[PDB]
Protein backbone atom coordinates (compact mmCIF):
# COMPACT_ATOMS: atom_id res chain seq x y z
CA UNK A 1 0.00 0.00 0.00
CA UNK A 2 3.16 2.16 0.29
CA UNK A 3 4.34 3.98 -2.79
CA UNK A 4 6.69 5.65 -0.29
CA UNK A 5 8.96 3.28 1.65
CA UNK A 6 11.73 3.10 4.22
CA UNK A 7 13.29 -0.31 3.84
CA UNK A 8 15.35 -2.62 6.00
CA UNK A 9 17.99 -4.91 4.52
CA UNK A 10 19.50 -8.37 5.12
CA UNK A 11 22.36 -10.26 3.54
CA UNK A 12 22.73 -12.84 0.78
CA UNK A 13 23.34 -16.53 1.64
CA UNK A 14 25.85 -18.75 -0.18
CA UNK A 15 28.33 -16.20 -1.60
CA UNK A 16 29.81 -17.45 -4.86
CA UNK A 17 33.62 -17.70 -4.95
CA UNK A 18 36.28 -19.78 -6.66
CA UNK A 19 36.52 -23.58 -6.47
CA UNK A 20 38.03 -26.50 -8.38
CA UNK A 21 36.28 -29.01 -10.62
CA UNK A 22 36.72 -32.78 -10.65
CA UNK A 23 36.17 -33.20 -14.41
CA UNK A 24 36.46 -36.67 -15.96
CA UNK A 25 38.47 -36.22 -19.15
CA UNK A 26 39.22 -39.84 -20.03
CA UNK A 27 41.45 -41.39 -22.68
CA UNK A 28 40.78 -40.57 -26.32
CA UNK A 29 40.84 -42.87 -29.37
CA UNK A 30 43.59 -44.72 -31.17
CA UNK A 31 46.05 -42.94 -33.44
CA UNK A 32 47.86 -44.70 -36.27
CA UNK A 33 50.20 -42.54 -38.32
CA UNK A 34 49.72 -43.23 -42.03
CA UNK A 35 51.26 -42.73 -45.42
CA UNK A 36 51.33 -38.95 -45.25
CA UNK A 37 48.77 -38.46 -42.47
CA UNK A 38 47.65 -39.82 -39.10
CA UNK A 39 44.30 -40.84 -37.69
CA UNK A 40 42.80 -41.09 -34.22
CA UNK A 41 39.52 -43.00 -33.93
CA UNK A 42 37.78 -41.38 -30.97
CA UNK A 43 35.48 -43.72 -29.07
CA UNK A 44 32.32 -42.65 -27.24
CA UNK A 45 32.54 -40.76 -23.93
CA UNK A 46 30.70 -37.89 -22.28
CA UNK A 47 30.07 -35.17 -24.91
CA UNK A 48 33.52 -33.79 -25.44
CA UNK A 49 34.78 -30.74 -27.34
Amino acid sequence: ADQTARRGKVHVPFPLTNVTCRVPLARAPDVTYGKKEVTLRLHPDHPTL
Partner: protein, 49 residues
Protein backbone atom coordinates in the same frame (compact mmCIF):
# COMPACT_ATOMS: atom_id res chain seq x y z
CA UNK B 1 21.38 -9.38 12.23
CA UNK B 2 23.74 -11.89 10.60
CA UNK B 3 26.13 -12.47 13.53
CA UNK B 4 23.15 -14.42 14.68
CA UNK B 5 21.10 -14.77 11.49
CA UNK B 6 17.90 -14.65 13.58
CA UNK B 7 18.09 -10.85 13.90
CA UNK B 8 17.57 -10.74 10.15
CA UNK B 9 15.07 -13.57 10.55
CA UNK B 10 13.10 -11.53 13.08
CA UNK B 11 13.23 -8.29 11.09
CA UNK B 12 11.46 -10.01 8.17
CA UNK B 13 8.23 -11.73 9.08
CA UNK B 14 7.38 -13.47 5.81
CA UNK B 15 4.11 -13.20 3.93
CA UNK B 16 2.54 -14.99 0.96
CA UNK B 17 3.27 -13.82 -2.60
CA UNK B 18 1.56 -13.92 -5.99
CA UNK B 19 1.22 -17.70 -6.14
CA UNK B 20 -0.49 -17.70 -9.52
CA UNK B 21 -0.64 -21.44 -10.28
CA UNK B 22 -0.18 -23.45 -7.10
CA UNK B 23 -2.66 -26.11 -8.15
CA UNK B 24 -3.61 -26.19 -11.77
CA UNK B 25 -3.86 -22.40 -12.03
CA UNK B 26 -5.22 -21.30 -8.66
CA UNK B 27 -3.87 -17.90 -7.75
CA UNK B 28 -3.63 -16.01 -4.47
CA UNK B 29 -1.01 -15.23 -1.93
CA UNK B 30 1.06 -18.43 -2.16
CA UNK B 31 2.71 -19.24 1.17
CA UNK B 32 5.97 -20.46 -0.34
CA UNK B 33 6.68 -17.78 -2.92
CA UNK B 34 9.35 -17.53 -5.62
CA UNK B 35 11.13 -14.27 -4.89
CA UNK B 36 14.45 -14.36 -6.73
CA UNK B 37 16.83 -16.75 -8.45
CA UNK B 38 20.47 -16.77 -7.41
CA UNK B 39 22.23 -18.78 -10.09
CA UNK B 40 25.20 -16.99 -11.63
CA UNK B 41 27.43 -19.90 -10.69
CA UNK B 42 29.62 -22.24 -12.68
CA UNK B 43 29.35 -24.42 -9.59
CA UNK B 44 26.00 -25.91 -10.70
CA UNK B 45 24.49 -23.68 -8.08
CA UNK B 46 20.86 -22.80 -8.10
CA UNK B 47 19.57 -20.57 -5.32
CA UNK B 48 15.88 -20.02 -4.62
CA UNK B 49 14.72 -16.92 -2.75
Amino acid sequence: SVTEHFNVYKATRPYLAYCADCGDGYFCYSPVAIEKIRDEAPDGMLKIQ
